[PDB]
């Protein structure tokens, strides 16, 4: 059973140079991510090794989803969990304008235009958490079944809250490929920042080899 009310509760429970600031905020949010995951139904019942696999595979996309949705009332910028706003022009002059703009146009602006709500966000993140394609999983079919339950609950919530928007459910799922590509590009940048070492311990562990 996968009630959207519990998923909402999970989101509400965790509510709080530019590359340095982004990194500090990300490290801090990794601790919060663990607390969020434990509130998603059935996750803590998975074998410890699997919980580890799922969080190491999904962490960067889960973090991107949160700061994008947090930033929807923000013009041309991003609200970090630390309370700091990072604007376009600031990211452009640090040499990271391209990736910043992708987040803004592909995620933030589209979340704003449709008024994606916090239950919808939480469900998308729970779907990303329960990724059955994660390597090493002791039972991928158990994770797939939990994924199926989240998106069945999501589809029923959209059809009830927004009955006049029949395409909304698909519209939500169709931000996930953008999220995946932006997550991959962010990882490349983080490995470069690690290399040109001018990064705190939890973020560092997430960038370690398995």
């Amino acid at each position: 059973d996968m009630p959207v009310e519990r998923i909402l509760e999970a989101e509400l429970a965790v509510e709080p140079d530019p590359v340095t600031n982004i990194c500090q905020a990300a490290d801090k949010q990794l601790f919060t991510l663990v607390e969020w995951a434990k509130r998603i139904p059935h996750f803590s019942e998975l074998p410890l090794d699997d919980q580890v696999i799922l969080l190491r595979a999904g962490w960067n996309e889960l973090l991107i989803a949160s700061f994008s949705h947090r930033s929807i009332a923000v013009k041309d910028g991003i609200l970090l969990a630390t309370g700091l706003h990072v604007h376009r022009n600031s990211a452009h002059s640090a040499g990271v304008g391209a990736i910043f703009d992708r987040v803004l146009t592909e995620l933030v602006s589209k979340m704003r235009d449709m008024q994606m709500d916090k239950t919808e966000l939480g469900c998308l993140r729970a779907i990303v958490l329960f990724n059955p394609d994660s390597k090493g999983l002791s039972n991928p079919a158990e994770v797939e079944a939990l994924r199926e339950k989240v998106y069945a609950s999501l589809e029923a919530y959209c059809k009830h809250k927004y009955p006049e928007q029949p395409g909304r459910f698909a519209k939500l799922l169709l931000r996930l490929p953008a999220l995946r590509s932006i997550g991959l590009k962010c990882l490349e940048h983080l490995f470069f920042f690690k290399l040109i070492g001018d990064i705190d311990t939890f973020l560092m562990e997430m960038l370690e080899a398995p």
Binding site: K38, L55, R56
Partner: peptide
Amino acid sequence: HKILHRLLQD
């Protein structure tokens, strides 16, 4: 992966 482990345990 000690930090993630310790946090998942309690």
